[PDB]
Design a protein around this ligand. Structure first.
Ligand SMILES: [Fe+3]
Ligand SMILES: [Fe+3]
Ligand SMILES: [Fe+3]
Ligand SMILES: [Fe+3]
Lengths: 198, 198, 198, 198
């Protein structure tokens, strides 16, 4: 049926001071809200293309279908990764996963931070699981749909779009990508991981 | 451990006349061969970055890791999708999947063809399963790692890179994307699908 | 010698209420400031690559050289296009240029607005002169360095990066791309045009 | 008026053995031929959009207008840069330009080669003149329209698209990017340069 904008497991301001409630609202209710509709639209148009056997604009339908389903898919997980009782570090299976995968949790943080802070333009930092080589990796996502292989299982995302922190951190993304760690929903992450390795 | 170039379930010329044996060789032994090594390299470099806690070139490591693991991941499936005893149409569960998903198998072919034939530059045509909205969709992949959402399960791919058909079809990709259907490994596709819906 | 961040021909708040002084500062002193240094860096690195005859990271040097020189080049013109005594419409030669080129000034505005408001991610709207076919065209720039032909002469740019209006307009870029017209430096534009046709 | 496919200043095989006559034909008469029409089309469509004040597909019109005018613009210069009586090295003003700009002609070759040989996917290697910082630089062009700043003056291009050498060199682009130098039209380059500095 249709894609729909999902509910937060918390109150828009749950995250201060690390993330502005202000931001959360706009993000969820505005920006997510949107991808959810483009998503639905593009699908719709393909529906119609095929029904009229006219794929003149195929290039454009695949690009909008890609772009919104993708922002929709990342913003959904972004929410789940966030949490007011989140923070510290991962434990057990995931935590181990991490150190063998990146040496230590700090090693991983580090790279994750670099990943995120150097996107040239819009983008995201993502920890995904490689079913290919059963590895744990970090990709630097450009925009919402580019720069990683098909089949990767997402684990922890961190929105680096300017609308993700400009109201608060302004031009200092560095500060925002730091704050980020203080609300990370490790639980959600650990679940995501278990499932993917299963 | 490392990524490795996989073995074909057939003899390089199994596919004539639809695809030149010549091509298959070059493709497998040359082009795939390569992505498999970049893949391994980029991983390696990240290993080293972190070990030297120097992520100055993070942008470049994530881009090479993305680009080769991605060509590696697509060329692997590309092989499996191909088959000398392949062809005709899908049956059962997948075949049904298809008609409710794109109206008919011809409707789907059509769109799939358009998808593929209009890439602006390098690229691929891909049928992937949406775990999000449990849908069956077609994406137009640019290069090897761009233009589709994270978490999509690949089902049927069709390499549209010039090195995929220039020796044979020259500038007429249209002809090649047609021939394509005659060696499609529906079996492989139907399996891929069952698994993803499971 | 080096690229340098240029001086504004006005006071940071000259532009309210159409553009926040706040924004102008950040933009100029922060974001521009930056591209000007990446610009200088990347150049520097190429200098060094060649001096050590090691172009292992060529991919990355060309990408940073492209990306910063490009943001540097667009933000420079962006400033010049802006003006507190700007506005209304173009006159004379340019104004004529425009109507034969896009039918009317409103026709052109319209398209220019659409151009800008639909970028998928970072980007800009640009009016450039085609020395090829001596035409006047509008391109939709992605990020800072992609989506237009080599040799185009820039005439009027409009920054659509989220950091260009989020503090003020928040998620409503539409509103910002409207306000835009009220400070357009037609004079600067008309000069730019004369020169290019010469 | 319209963009038109230009005439070569030589016979399709003028370039063997360095470039296959076969290739030249296909390239000129097929691939160029095409960009010249997309070019004309996209323009046409914008014409129509505006006439119907319907810019729903603006994203797609700007992308096709960008992509074909760009391949059209690069392939045009590509022809001019090529020459049967070409080769050796540049002289006078340009030659000097080069050594102060990249240290030596070999330093420049080197970087130019690296530039070209590592494109990830489609792309080109380009020497352009920076009116910004009056510099001489090399950019790595992705596809046909991405990866360099607006306002760069093209000087020497080298098509790295697979259809530019696969028939001949197959997967060994390295060999082709070498051969390249043997037909470079320095004259054309030296003129291009004089003009740009003027
Ligand atoms: Fe976002
Ligand atoms: Fe391939
Ligand atoms: Fe900006
Ligand atoms: Fe070409």
């Amino acid at each position: 049926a249709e894609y729909t904008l999902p509910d937060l497991d918390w109150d828009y301001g749950a995250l201060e001071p690390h993330i502005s409630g202000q931001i959360n609202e706009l993000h969820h209710s505005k920006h997510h809200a949107t991808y959810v509709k483009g998503a639905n639209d593009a699908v719709a148009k393909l529906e119609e293309a095929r029904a009229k056997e006219d794929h003149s604009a195929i290039l454009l339908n695949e690009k909008n279908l890609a772009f919104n389903l993708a922002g929709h898919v990342n913003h959904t997980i972004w929410w789940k990764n966030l949490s007011p009782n989140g923070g510290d570090k991962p434990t057990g299976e995931l935590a181990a996963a991490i150190a063998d995968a990146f040496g230590s949790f700090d090693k991983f943080r580090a790279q994750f931070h670099a990943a995120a802070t150097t996107v040239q333009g819009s983008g995201w930092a993502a920890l995904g699981w490689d079913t290919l080589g059963n590895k744990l990796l970090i990709f630097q996502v450009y925009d919402q749909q580019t720069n990683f292989p098909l089949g990767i299982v997402p684990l922890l995302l961190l929105d680096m779009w300017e609308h993700a922190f400009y109201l608060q951190y302004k031009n200092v993304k560095v500060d925002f990508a730091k704050a980020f760690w203080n609300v990370v929903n490790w639980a959600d992450v650990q679940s995501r991981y278990a499932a993917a390795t299963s």
